[PDB]
Amino acid sequence: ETFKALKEYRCGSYDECEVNQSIYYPNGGDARKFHSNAKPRAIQIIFSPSVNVRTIKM
Amino acid sequence: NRDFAGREQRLFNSEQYNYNNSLNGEVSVWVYAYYSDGSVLVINKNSQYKVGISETFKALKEYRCGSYDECEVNQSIYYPNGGDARKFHSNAKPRAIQIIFSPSVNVRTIKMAKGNAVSVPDEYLQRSHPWEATGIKYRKIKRDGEIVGYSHYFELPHEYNSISLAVSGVHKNPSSYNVGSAHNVMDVFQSCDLALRFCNRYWAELELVNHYISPNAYPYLDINNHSYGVALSNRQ
Amino acid sequence: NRDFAGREQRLFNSEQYNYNNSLNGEVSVWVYAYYSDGSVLVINKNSQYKVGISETFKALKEYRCGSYDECEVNQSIYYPNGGDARKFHSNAKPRAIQIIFSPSVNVRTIKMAKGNAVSVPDEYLQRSHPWEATGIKYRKIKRDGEIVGYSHYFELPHEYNSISLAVSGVHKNPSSYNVGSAHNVMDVFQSCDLALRFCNRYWAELELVNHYISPNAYPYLDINNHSYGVALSNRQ
Amino acid sequence: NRDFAGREQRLFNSEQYNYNNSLNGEVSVWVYAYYSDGSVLVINKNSQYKVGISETFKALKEYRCGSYDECEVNQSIYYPNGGDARKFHSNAKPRAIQIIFSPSVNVRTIKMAKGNAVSVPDEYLQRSHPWEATGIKYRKIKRDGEIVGYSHYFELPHEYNSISLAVSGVHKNPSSYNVGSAHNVMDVFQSCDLALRFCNRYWAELELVNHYISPNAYPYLDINNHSYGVALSNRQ
């Protein structure tokens, strides 16, 4: 997944487009906020027990 | 001793320091509320004799000038499962509070009523003292060796940290003249009407420092523990 | 007399009753405004020493979180035929008011200024006493033989019942220590800053009872004349 | 020969050049689509062993973050007079494409399937070879005598230039170790999952150069035929 694809989207934007521009390059965007709450705070990766753990790559 | 420009600059600054600390001067309080989006709400009150601020749970939540779901969030914060909200944690809730007093406060007079979300200081009204005297927790904001303000900082990092908040302080008065004695009590009543209030939301702490704290020679302590303000006593 | 769990439960409850009634405790007021849609607005204030609430005509009208015509309604209520409204009776006007005080109030201190829609207590300022002492009209809200609160209920069933409203009460004080004497008057001034306020609109009286009154051990008297609250003095 | 800062800087840069070109390093492709409003869409993919990009006709059209007529435009591009569109030429269609590969590609492995708007490489499926080997058309993007990338630029200036597009290249491998031999084929399958993709639309080529190409040390060839990138082999 891309940076943009991991951000929160609530089914049913302009400012968050600019947030992305300002995250790709410092001061690259014209955003109305310091920290976007749509950014993930954490990630958990889970594999099934059928994986071989020594093959996992990230 | 013939550098009169020098002597007068030092006196001009010292007079400012001392006037603020006189019974004729201001006492000021600020409440900063910090939101997860990095914005900061500031409420300020400036008055003679005594000063304070009191806000509801709802009034401390983030509002971006220029709702239905956040109404329901409030219902669900007043009573568990009382609302029909489409979210677990509202990002409009403050994550932290800083209370700052001017150096003209007497720290031993500071009082705070940090209530729950239905504005009860301590679980139930029947067992609530209406305030706590929190002065011992205030840190000195210092610049150049001078106390420029007093700060109390607290996080609300837990889901259950849903608060109403009032704070109050009395202007210092090392004299034995009681400003609330019969001779002047009507002046203190008038001071309640004369107090000026200010509130505004800054997009970032940088903007708060640059455009609110610094231009007005106010004291501040930032998230990095850095002190801001201007030292005036016996200083050029 | 060796059932210490029993003795301690009774003391815990009695201490709550007595603390609230001490000069260290809260005095509280609530104003309920009832609308024709069956919703209820509540305004609460909790403070030491004394407490009150003051609202404009406009502030008491129903507002459903999440206007042009209702602005004009106000113009037409301030002066007959002063507005260009598209309706005879606004359903946002309250149909009734109930004022409730905590049992820590002294009923003889209660004062009410029920003004007209331009906030004049009695027709013209020049002939207005600024309040009426209405304590004699307050009914005791009782549970289990204990006074848990005091209620004054009045309907506004007529088209001409368009009001502004303020109410005030003083915490009981059977001692001869005047809490507003010079020794403590600055504490009463601070109490004005420290008072916590709450306001919210409930969809129905059921929801008000279930989610506002009951969880907080507040007193209430419903439209059916049924009393709610919790008796604590010498009780398990 | 005792300027070790000098020797180490040259080695640091050379190691970067050589690592990228190793079987352990990245191979990267970019597709730039140029619109008549001067904006540029970039799609990038970075992977080990091999890399490519495949997009539909619809996916290459301009989209400005923050439709009905453009849906109909698509219908009228899939089949003549198939749509009910309110315009002759959609300005959302790209006017030109540039494909850039990293210098770690082997140019003789590059393949492109430039289809029609219904995603057929050559008029009808039945007579289509699924790709063309276009490496001979790629120009060397050079800085300071070093190949920093490879570019294929083509205009779509005609009304009938309505395309779907895929491009693919293999990381250079001058060894006789086949990275797709049985010993490592599962690693190449994993590389398909591990490839990272990026896409964004820049308002102007200036902004693309300033904020996308330059900060990331990527290669680029602008509309004026000027080369960008960073030469690293044996260089300080």
Q: What is the 3-state secondary structure (H, E, C) of D13-72?
A: HHHHHHHHHCCCCEEEEEEEEEECCCCEEEEEEEEECEEEEEECHHHHCCCCCCCHHHHH
Answer yes or no: do C192 and B52 touch at CB < 8 A: yes
Q: Enumerate the residues of chain B whose CB falls inside 8 A of the CB of residue C199.
A: 56
Minimal C-alpha gap between A38 and chain B (Å): 10
Answer yes or no: do A28 and D199 touch at CB < 8 A: no
Which 8-state DSSP code applies to residue B210?
I
Q: Smallest Cα–Cα separation from B52: which of B128, B116, B127, B134?
A: B134
Q: Enumerate the residues of chain A whose CB falls inside 8 A of the CB of residue B37.
A: 33-37
Domain boundaries, chain C: 1-236
Minimal C-alpha gap between D79 and chain A (Å): 33
> Which residue in chain A has the smallest CA separation from D191?
A57
Q: Which residues contact B102 (CB under 8 A, 6 or more apart)?
A: B20, B26, B27, B28, B29, B149, B219
Rounded distance between C-alpha atoms, residue C130 and residue C138, angstroms: 20
Strand (E) positions, B17-66?
Answer: 26-35, 40-48, 50-55
Answer yes or no: do B39 and A33 touch at CB < 8 A: yes
Among the partner residues B50, B74, B112, nearest to C186 by beta-carbon distance: B50
Rounded distance between C-alpha atoms, residue D30 and residue C83, angstroms: 66
> Which residue in chain A has the smallest CA separation from B40?
A34
Q: Is D68 exposed, middle or buried (0-12, 13-18, 19+ CB in 10 A)?
A: exposed
Answer yes or no: do D194 and A57 touch at CB < 8 A: yes
Burial letters D20-56, b for 16+ CB under 10 A, else e: bbeeebbbbbbbbbbbeeebbbbbbbbbbbbbbbbbb
Burial letters B140-171, b for 16+ CB under 10 A, else e: ebebeebebbbbbbeebeeeebbbbbbbbbbb
Among the partner residues A3, A13, A28, nearest to D66 by beta-carbon distance: A13
Strand (E) positions, B122-177?
Answer: 139-143, 146-155, 164-170
Q: Enumerate the residues of chain A whose CB falls inside 8 A of the CB of residue D210.
A: 25
Rounded distance between C-alpha atoms, residue C101 and residue C53, angstroms: 11
Answer yes or no: do C46 and B182 touch at CB < 8 A: no
Q: Enumerate the residues of chain A whose CB falls inside 8 A of the CB of residue B39.
A: 33-34
Q: Enumerate the residues of chain A whose CB falls inside 8 A of the CB of residue D196.
A: 2
Answer yes or no: do B185 and C190 touch at CB < 8 A: no
| B132 strand-pairing partners | B112
Q: Enumerate the residues of chain A whose CB falls inside 8 A of the CB of residue D186.
A: 55
Q: Smallest Cα–Cα separation from D100: which of D40, D167, D21?
A: D167
Answer yes or no: do C196 and B54 touch at CB < 8 A: yes
Answer yes or no: do D211 and A25 touch at CB < 8 A: yes
**In angstroms, how far is CA A26 from the centroid of its own chain?**
17
Residue reference for tokens 């007021």: C29
Structure tokens at C22: 């001490």
CA triple B217-B104-B98, angle to 5 deg: 65
> Which residue in chain A has the smallest CA separation from D201?
A21
Minimal C-alpha gap between A6 and chain D (Å): 13
CB atoms within 10 A of CB C30: 24
Q: Which residues contact C15 (CB under 8 A, 6 or more apart)?
A: B127
> Is D128:D210 a contact under the CB 8 Å cutoff?
no
Rounded distance between C-alpha atoms, residue D97 and residue D76, angstroms: 22
Chain D residues within 8 Å of chain A (Cβ atoms) = 65-66, 186, 190, 194, 196-200, 210-212, 215
| B94 strand-pairing partners | B35
Structure tokens at C19: 């603390």
Mutate to test the interface with B, among A30, A34, A37, A41 (most CBs of B within 10 A): A34
Q: Smallest Cα–Cα separation from B186: which of B54, B48, B46?
A: B48
> Which residue in chain B has the smallest CA separation from C232?
B126
Minimal C-alpha gap between C204 and chain B (Å): 13
Ramachandran area for residue B81 (φ above 0: left; ψ -120 to 50: alpha; else beta)? left
Q: Enumerate the residues of chain D whose CB falls inside 8 A of the CB of residue A16.
A: 66
3-state secondary structure of D92: coil
CA triple D103-D108-D113, angle to 5 deg: 100
> Which residue in chain B has the smallest CA separation from C25?
B129
Q: Enumerate the residues of chain B whose CB falls inside 8 A of the CB of residue C20.
A: 125-127
Q: Tell me, what amino acid is at D92? A: A
Answer yes or no: do C197 and B56 touch at CB < 8 A: yes
Q: What is the resolution of this structure in A?
A: 1.7
> Which residue in chain B has the smallest CA separation from A36?
B37
Touching subunits of A (3+ CB pairs, under 8 Å) are B, D
H helix runs in chain C, sequence order? 4-21, 57-60, 68-78, 185-194, 205-208
Q: Is A47 exposed, middle or buried (0-12, 13-18, 19+ CB in 10 A)?
A: exposed
Which approach determined this entry? X-ray
Q: What does R_g of chain B's alpha carbons equal in angstroms? A: 20
* DSSP codes of every residue in B94-123: EEEEEEEE-TTB-GGG-EEEEE-TTS-TTS
After which residues does chain C have a break in its backbone, defined as C to next N over 2.5 Å? 66
| C150 strand-pairing partners | C101, C140
* Residue C22, CB-side half-sphere exposure with 13 Å CA sphere: 14
Please state whether at least 3 CB pairs lie below 8 Å between chains A and D: yes
| B52 strand-pairing partners | B168
Answer yes or no: do C48 and B130 touch at CB < 8 A: yes
Q: Is D172 exposed, middle or buried (0-12, 13-18, 19+ CB in 10 A)?
A: buried
Minimal C-alpha gap between A53 and chain B (Å): 34
> How big is the A-D interface in CB pairs under 8 Å?
29
> Is B156:B163 a contact under the CB 8 Å cutoff?
yes
Which 8-state DSSP code applies to residue A54?
G
Answer yes or no: do B128 and C191 touch at CB < 8 A: no
Rounded distance between C-alpha atoms, residue D17 and residue D32, angstroms: 24
CB atoms within 10 A of CB D19: 12
Question: Phi and psi at residue B137, in whole multiples of 5°?
Answer: -85, -15
Structure tokens at C82: 């002063």
3-state secondary structure of B202: strand
Q: Enumerate the residues of chain C whose CB falls inside 8 A of the CB of residue B167.
A: 193-194
